[PDB]
Design a protein around this ligand. Sequence first.
Ligand SMILES: *[C@@H]1O[C@H](CO)[C@@H](O)[C@H](O)[C@H]1NC(C)=O
Ligand SMILES: *[C@@H]1O[C@H](CO)[C@@H](O)[C@H](O)[C@H]1NC(C)=O
Ligand SMILES: *[C@@H]1O[C@H](CO)[C@@H](O)[C@H](O)[C@H]1NC(C)=O
Ligand SMILES: *[C@@H]1O[C@H](CO)[C@@H](O)[C@H](O)[C@H]1NC(C)=O
Ligand SMILES: [Cl-]
Ligand SMILES: [Cl-]
Ligand SMILES: [Cl-]
Ligand SMILES: [Cl-]
Ligand SMILES: [Cl-]
Ligand SMILES: [Cl-]
Ligand SMILES: [Cl-]
Ligand SMILES: [Cl-]
Ligand SMILES: [Cl-]
Ligand SMILES: [Cl-]
Ligand SMILES: [Cl-]
Ligand SMILES: [Cl-]
Ligand SMILES: [Cl-]
Ligand SMILES: [Cl-]
Lengths: 532, 532
Amino acid sequence: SELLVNTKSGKVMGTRVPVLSSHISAFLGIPFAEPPVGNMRFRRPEPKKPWSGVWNASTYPNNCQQYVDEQFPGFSGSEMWNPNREMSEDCLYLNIWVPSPRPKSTTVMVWIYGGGFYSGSSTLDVYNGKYLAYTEEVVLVSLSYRVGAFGFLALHGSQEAPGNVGLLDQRMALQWVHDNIQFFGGDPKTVTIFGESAGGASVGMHILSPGSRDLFRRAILQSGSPNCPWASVSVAEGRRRAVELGRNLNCNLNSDEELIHCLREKKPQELIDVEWNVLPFDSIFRFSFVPVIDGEFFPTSLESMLNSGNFKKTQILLGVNKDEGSFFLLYGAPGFSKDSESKISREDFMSGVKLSVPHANDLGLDAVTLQYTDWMDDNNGIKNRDGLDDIVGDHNVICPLMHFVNKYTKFGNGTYLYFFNHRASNLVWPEWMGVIHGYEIEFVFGLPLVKELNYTAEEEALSRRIMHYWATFAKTGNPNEPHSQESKWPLFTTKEQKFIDLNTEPMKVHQRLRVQMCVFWNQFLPKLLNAT
Amino acid sequence: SELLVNTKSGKVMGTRVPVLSSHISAFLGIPFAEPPVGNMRFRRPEPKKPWSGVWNASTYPNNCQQYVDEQFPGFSGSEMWNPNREMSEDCLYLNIWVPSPRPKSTTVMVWIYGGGFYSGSSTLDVYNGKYLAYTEEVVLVSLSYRVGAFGFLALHGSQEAPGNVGLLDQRMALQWVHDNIQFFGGDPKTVTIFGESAGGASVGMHILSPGSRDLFRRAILQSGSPNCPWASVSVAEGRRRAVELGRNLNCNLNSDEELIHCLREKKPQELIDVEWNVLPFDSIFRFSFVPVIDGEFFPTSLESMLNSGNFKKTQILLGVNKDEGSFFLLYGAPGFSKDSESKISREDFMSGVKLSVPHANDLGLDAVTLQYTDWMDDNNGIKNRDGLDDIVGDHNVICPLMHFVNKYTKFGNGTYLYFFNHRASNLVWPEWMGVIHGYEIEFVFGLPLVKELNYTAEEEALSRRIMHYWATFAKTGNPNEPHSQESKWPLFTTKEQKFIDLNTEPMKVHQRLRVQMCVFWNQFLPKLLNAT
Ligand SMILES: *[C@@H]1O[C@H](CO)[C@@H](O)[C@H](O)[C@H]1NC(C)=O
Ligand SMILES: *[C@@H]1O[C@H](CO)[C@@H](O)[C@H](O)[C@H]1NC(C)=O
Ligand SMILES: *[C@@H]1O[C@H](CO)[C@@H](O)[C@H](O)[C@H]1NC(C)=O
Ligand SMILES: *[C@@H]1O[C@H](CO)[C@@H](O)[C@H](O)[C@H]1NC(C)=O
Ligand SMILES: [Cl-]
Ligand SMILES: [Cl-]
Ligand SMILES: [Cl-]
Ligand SMILES: [Cl-]
Ligand SMILES: [Cl-]
Ligand SMILES: [Cl-]
Ligand SMILES: [Cl-]
Ligand SMILES: [Cl-]
Ligand SMILES: [Cl-]
Ligand SMILES: [Cl-]
Ligand SMILES: [Cl-]
Ligand SMILES: [Cl-]
Ligand SMILES: [Cl-]
Ligand SMILES: [Cl-]
């Protein structure tokens, strides 16, 4: 039967799902690891033990335990990102959308959700892979991984809570795809991993980690890079936060053994309730439990690996959105509100700068302030607001990604860069937030093709073009079709550094994405902070 | 007789000079101090001993001993600034142009020549005061003062070479004007001192020095301020340079007495021949012997005086030119040449930055480089050239003047600011140099009114408007005529900070002159250099 597939782990029975007046096969909630529960909390994942009989893969799995956004109850803009399934530590499953009839050996794309490593679900409506699988005829997989303390609590030296286990969850899912996707009609030698935000940083981390490189062919990074300031911490800082978490839960801190034992006795929500109390600074765009530079998953520092070419050399497609920082300013910076234009005073601008670059000394803060202040009109509330927005986006996403692309391209086999600046016509968030962190995803997954979602004809066209760019890149390593009549997305080279905008207007090629600000963030500021 | 005037120092006989189809009286070469020769070299000036008989004031006096520019022999652009009279240490004289018939009690303007404190003459054709005196009907005086080691060698603690004697020369001339100008028809209570470059810095220094304040009514500063980085040195640095000068002349350095004795035995040219060898850094826009912050002429640091309002409170009119730095880049920066467009490579740009900000550490140099580099087009030779030009002008003239104007205006009684950006139609210097340091002077002195000089009709008009602004300001403290129909030059205020451009186009009012760069030079960079 088309819905019955026999894998090395056992048989699975999918379900026939409708999609754009047609149908495709969906295998939802396939386990790829043993439930990381009980004494398995914080520990590396273990392969799922093969099962007898048929596994019912007709419904989505549970979502991993995580902090839930309740800042705007009843508001779809925020709630569309929250878990839409019941949360459980038993959450290591993957979903597969397969074209009908079942392909023989077709391109595979594996989605890695974002969420700052503290949240995320593979089951969100915005991640429904049926449109992309159907339209581009690819086998689309979405995996899952532990987030928060459950996936990243790090007490280096310990084998019970070594850190990075969420990344190992991702790897195990990729391993399962490598070992079994052939049975679903997918080609294991042509797998493209793609993800947004923390998912994009993760994709980059697998490109770097020797233990992950052999599990995929090429990669796509959306609004995230392995070197982002929020994407990793040192083993020392990771240890400090784990201890502080224990301190928040009245744990015995005499030893790792005692600490871990205590943390394992706590209910999931107990850890989540104090998770944000372990941050070292009053900040925004900084998350508690994230990957740790351990000397194992990451042999050496990310920068030395990038400089020495110690990473998988293949083709990559990546990019950023126009206003990556607006979301986090709304949630944690003074002067910003969801229902106002959020014009910011010079006072709130300064406060915002300090929250955005928490690790900087006063000289560093002065440098940032001067770099983003128009002294001919310093009390302009709109300029102050947009300036802070740019600071947050440049520092946390754009400039780190630009540093990554330039370093990677020196050793890589092909780079394609984009700048997504289309503000959706049906966005529920205020206009001041612009092109928000994560809002290119709906276009990548083809939501604009669904009439009921209220997108414009132009937006359906943009989505189809994006899905085709992504799928063609996954299939060939080039988003452009051979001998096509359409505008060509040029290769990003060390010399010309070209990129294209992604919007409803005719294609435009540019060079040196935000180079002026990124020289500040990537070269000058770090030098200043190190000298002072 | 109209040409005979009896002063407190004795009688003087002037000469009738032609000017624009008319005539005026000129009293040239009037001594105001005893010749600072022999054992009087380096020492404070002494009042000129009254003389019997009639002093012949029909011809210009000698020019003070100074370095002579021989970089472009036969070229008027450079030679017009060199001494046009024989050089001698016996050079403390002043010149007076008086309207005919002799006024009774009219506005007086006293010119203080510039030249980086290492050069300058009151006798240059460009300083001929007959046009201004005639046209605006003011008594115009041009004084002189010792420059170079002769006027600024400083061995603090010694009374034989205390430093600042060139400034004391200026003061003595102002004292003479205060005591005698009434006999020439000038009003001693309505004297305006004005000067360019080092002359502008000097005007500001007299505003600051308690010993000079009572000698004038108001002031005009052109392309120079007391706080310019090249305008003064500490007593320690002044002492170091005096000793180094002696070292260059094989002097006994065992004591100030021995050093001074040796220096006094040397011929003038011997000192001049090694004057430039005492600079501490490889630099441009830095001169060897300049005013010293002695605790006498200047009670405390210039900045503390400015902050505390420890200065003469009156009205001031001041401004700068568009390209103040081009001249010094031509003479000392790599890549610049008089007969080429001087497009500069990134390499020469970096070298130029280091020469322009000699006191900065590498971090500081990086800060300047980033502030003036367009990273979207960093190899643009024209942008690099103009960028360096701006760095030199901003750092050495504009930003220091802007810091002065903002500090002064808080306590002053009226500030008028200008930005001179007119490139003369008959300029002999290359186009790349733009509106050069010192080239607004010819307009202030009315040279464009002389048909034979080849200026345009528009330039004659601009000159007349400038001369009238200057003279009206000197007369009333406001460059605008009461109940006039012409555009009004607004008062510069702490809040609106308005200024006007000075060119052949209709008046335009602007605000916050080069505020973005000046915040960098006046606030950020100093903080960076002090923290590192
Ligand atoms: C799970 O599999 C069973 C078959 O045993 C099927 O009837 C059911 O619809 C599947 N999912 C649900 C709705 O529980
Ligand atoms: C990618 O590698 C192949 C050889 O494996 C080479 O022919 C090709 O030029 C490379 N492409 C780029 C853009 O580096
Ligand atoms: C100096 O004064 C004398 C009068 O004794 C006069 O003849 C002469 O022209 C003046 N200047 C010159 C030309 O030496
Ligand atoms: C200057 O001072 C006088 C009082 O002496 C005052 O009336 C006038 O307002 C002041 N002008 C400015 C611009 O400060
Ligand atoms: Cl549908
Ligand atoms: Cl411990
Ligand atoms: Cl805190
Ligand atoms: Cl916050
Ligand atoms: Cl970069
Ligand atoms: Cl929306
Ligand atoms: Cl809205
Ligand atoms: Cl004439
Ligand atoms: Cl000595
Ligand atoms: Cl040197
Ligand atoms: Cl030089
Ligand atoms: Cl300023
Ligand atoms: Cl000229
Ligand atoms: Cl020319």
